[PDB]
Amino acid sequence: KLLSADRAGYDVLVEELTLANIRIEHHKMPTGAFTTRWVAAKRDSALRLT
Amino acid sequence: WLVMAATCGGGSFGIGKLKSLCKEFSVPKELRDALRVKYGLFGGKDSLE
Structure with a gap:
């Protein structure tokens, strides 16, 4: 009893302008420096998302 | 640095200092x-009448 229907449807456109402016501050490509820790010692690295 | 710090952060207790280069x-x-005890033992070294 599968009922997904494709059209189916759608568309648209426109433009515008106005203006205004505013402032903050900037947004639109921020880089995040995640830090992982499992014992007293720690590793840290940076990544980006659009 | 507060994230690596976790539960305890921004709690300085004592600061050690050292020389960069080596000499003398x-x-x-x-x-x-x-130093606050400016002359603890140095003032009276071996003075006796």
């Missing part, structure tokens, strides 16, 4: 403890 006197620096 070694200078491992935490004798400041006996």
Whole structure:
């Protein structure tokens, strides 16, 4: 009893302008420096998302 | 640095100091403890009548 229907449807456109402016501050490509820790010692690295 | 810090952060307790280059006197620096006590043992070395 599968009922997904494709059209189916759608568309648209426109433009515008106005203006205004505013402032903050900037947004639109921020880089995040995640830090992982499992014992007293720690590793840290940076990544980006659009 | 507060994230690596976790539960305890921004809680300075004691600050040690040291020389960058090496020369003359070694200078491992935490004798400041006996600086507020300006002349604890040095004032009276071996004075006796």
